[PDB]
Design a protein around this ligand. Structure first.
Ligand SMILES: O=C(O)CCC(=O)C(=O)O
Ligand SMILES: O=C(O)CCC(=O)C(=O)O
Ligand SMILES: [Co+2]
Ligand SMILES: [Co+2]
Lengths: 207, 207
DNA sequence: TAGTGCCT
DNA sequence: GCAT
């Protein structure tokens, strides 16, 4: 079934942890996306991102003229983001628990969609005010190479092949570690067809 | 010397700084000879009954302007005195004993309470990195330390903290409400008629 | 700012 | 490493 692969202090890959729940989540990805479509956000410096994005839950990650921000409102629809699906919340809390983060209460889910070539540059998740809360990151569909630092931009990166069902969780000592996804290679998956989805759960607000 | 549970992520290290107390006080005096103890007025207009100074990279002060973490002491227009080795060793030993092996303070606020002096119920919420615990050292006269929950009105535990007692809280109890009741007059051989507290914090960003 | 691209 |  599902196994573990430690990464760094506070960081684990829960291999295939989400494999069983994958269909229900992908279904929910569609339902979220029907309310708040995937869009390729433009960074504050004017770059269009290659990853296409949407959000569900109380707070959604968004780009804005003044920098990267969490908003209760989808500027694409000027409505609040969709409620977080029960399957999202359930899988997430299970993972955070299996990962040794017992009381994770996410208020934010970023949905990433990678088409072939799409990537996400090395970066830290530092837009969140409460650093105690872990990051839970679910991989679905096409395989990708995830790199994992690194408190500095340039200390050794681990390069991990993340497959459909894999969940990476990080936090505590590794909460601000650099990470990213290399240009997605083309392929097929039965459940996602031609792309890779990622679900990043966070506590983006304040307890 | 010994441990007592206080809350999730919080312990009392009874008499933990008893052995080092004489050196800590000498180190207080030296720190004070550069950045003297001073009164502070809060944004409310009330002068605090506690006198304060700081040592370490970042010092906390409050004003009718608002509180401030700064590398400069407003009274001297110079950096706060560097963190004394005794302070740094004791803090780290305390934090490891309390389950926080990686605590690196960059800030120590020194409080001096005279009889009648108090510190109103509050949260330590000014620090951006909430993963770092608070290490809280008692010296001299005994005081009642209030320790509650996340909300202002959550039930309060009245704890009698005595010379050498160290309190450590973090994780789930990190933002818990707490405070000091008006100090009763008394005598202590090492402080005469007053109580010192060392509050160690990570006030800036961790490396 | 840069969650990008090395711009010529 | 750096641009702004
Ligand atoms: O797609 C991934 O696996 C990583 C996602 C990510 O870095 C993010 O959402 O911040
Ligand atoms: O004197 C004490 O033990 C409490 C000090 C405190 O709560 C503070 O400085 O914020
Ligand atoms: Co990220
Ligand atoms: Co306090």
């Amino acid at each position: 079934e599902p196994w573990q692969e430690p990464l760094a202090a506070g960081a684990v890959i829960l291999r295939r942890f989400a494999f069983n729940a994958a269909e229900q989540l992908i279904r929910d990805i569609n339902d979220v996306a029907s309310q708040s479509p995937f869009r390729q956000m433009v960074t504050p410096g004017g770059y269009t991102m290659s990853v296409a994005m949407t959000n569900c839950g109380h707070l959604g990650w968004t780009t804005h003229r003044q920098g990267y921000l969490y908003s209760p409102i989808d500027p694409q629809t000027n409505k609040p983001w969709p409620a977080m699906p029960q399957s999202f919340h359930n899988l997430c809390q299970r993972a955070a628990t299996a990962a040794g983060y017992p009381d994770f209460q996410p208020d934010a889910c970023l949905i990433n969609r990678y088409a072939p070539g799409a990537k996400l540059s090395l970066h830290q998740d530092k837009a969140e005010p409460d650093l105690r809360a872990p990051i839970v990151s679910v991989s679905l569909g096409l395989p990708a190479i995830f790199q994992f630092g690194g408190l500095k931009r340039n200390d050794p990166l681990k390069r991990l092949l993340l497959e459909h069902g894999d969940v990476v969780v990080w936090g505590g000592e590794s909460r601000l570690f650099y990470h990213g996804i290399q240009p997605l290679k083309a392929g097929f998956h039965p459940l996602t067809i031609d792309c890779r989805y990622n679900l990043t759960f966070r506590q983006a607000g304040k307890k």
